[PDB]
């Protein structure tokens, strides 16, 4: 389901000023990083299974 769609067009106690506004968000490439340990500290390092 590659895209999200919203929509709004007319009357909001307005003066006949209508505007169709579709909101759209499109999902693209997927990326992977190697597994990482982030301490509560904030310091990071690569995580291996034994840890």
Tell me about this structure.
With 51 residues, the protein is an all-beta fold. The chain has strands at residues 3-5, 24-26, 36-38, 44-46. It has a two-stranded antiparallel ribbon. A hairpin with a 5-residue loop joins strand 3 and strand 4. The protein is elongated, with a radius of gyration of 23 Å. It is classed as transcription. The entry lists the keywords transcription, complex. The entry is titled "RNA Polymerase II elongation complex bound with Spt5 KOW5 and Elf1".
Q: Please give the order of strands in the largest beta sheet.
A: 1-2
- How much is the radius of gyration in Å? 23 Å
Which strand-content bin applies to the residues? 15-25%
Largest beta-sheet characterization: 2 strands, antiparallel
How many individual β-strands? 4
Helix and strand content put the structural class at: mainly beta
Helix content: under 10%
| Helix-strand topology string | EEEE
Give me the number of helical elements: 0
Distance between the termini: 37 Å
Overall 3D form: elongated
Mind sketching the topology for me?
Elements: E1 3-5, E2 24-26, E3 36-38, E4 44-46
Antiparallel strand pairs: 1-2, 3-4
Task: Provide a compact summary of the structure.
This protein is mainly beta and 51 residues long. The chain has strands spanning 3-5, 24-26, 36-38, 44-46.
Comma- or semicolon-separated keywords:
1 chains, 51 residues, mainly beta, two-stranded antiparallel ribbon
């Amino acid at each position: 389901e590659p895209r999200l769609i919203l929509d709004q067009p007319a009357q909001h106690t307005n003066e006949k000023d209508n505007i169709n506004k579709r909101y759209e968000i499109r999902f693209g490439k997927i990326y992977l990083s190697r597994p990482t340990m982030t301490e509560a500290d904030g310091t990071t390092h690569a995580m291996f299974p034994q840890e």
